[PDB]
């Protein structure tokens with residue numbers, strides 16, 4: 675009734691430890707603080723849609739999503755994909771200074787967690803491609819569950 | 821305090837509409853009835869571990885998981901992977917008749933949902949490989965969120 679509005683913040687951040695699919699798409703559900711992250715080979719409009727398809731399966735459909743003005747978020751293709759799901763999109767104030775510190779903070783916690791767990795498994799540089807998926811899933815678990 | 825025990829049921833089911841990665845690994849969290857499904861090319865011990873890595877990221881670590889005696893669930897490799905996470909594993913009673921109707925039911929709801937959504941998009945036989953991921957994610961959303 676009076677609980678938080680279901681607003682997500684989403685952003686992409688680069689992580690060479692996860693190459694070749696080094697772009698991580700990160701969504702923070704601002705009502706719960708849960709984090710959803712997926713890995714992608716290139717930052718395109720279709721990679722953002724594939725990330726949100728997975729975040730929806732996991733967190734439900736939000737009422738709105740806030741992003742920056744990155745072109746994979748403002749293309750015609752991504753605007754139509756969000757209209758097909760009935761989700762409102764805002765890039766907030768222009769020179770907003772950033773109405774998305776929560777996802778910015780999530781991005782740093784996430785890359786720190788990835789580094790600490792990868793180094794615990796003995797991977798000091800790039801994580802071998804066949805170990806990436808389970809280590810990303812472990813970083814996600816660690817940041818969402820207590 | 822007196823709520824449901826965190827027990828999952830997991831099973832693999834075959835779905836040719838999703839070929840080549842036609843094996844679907846399905847986990848039902850018996851306390852919440854939430855469903856987690858991932859797609860795999862072969863039914864192996866590593867495909868079950870990769871599915872549970874993702875289910876853990878999404879639902880948290882359970883106290884125990886019930887499966888059938890399928891060899892990808894009873895191998896040495898899968899038993900050690902569950903011991904590393906500290907999760908108890910039971911295949912229930914031997915000739916239990918099936919202590920896993922919930923996941924059995926989830927399997928049929930899931931393949932029905934996949935068929936109805938794929939046919940709504942015009943795919944009457946196999947779903948094209950590049951449309952699979954978003955349609956699986958849509959079937960998962962539809963069965964978990966109201």
Ligand SMILES: [Mn+2]
Pocket residue numbers: 685686742744
């Ligand atoms: Mn950005």
Ligand SMILES: [Mn+2]
Pocket residue numbers: 831832888890
């Ligand atoms: Mn089975």
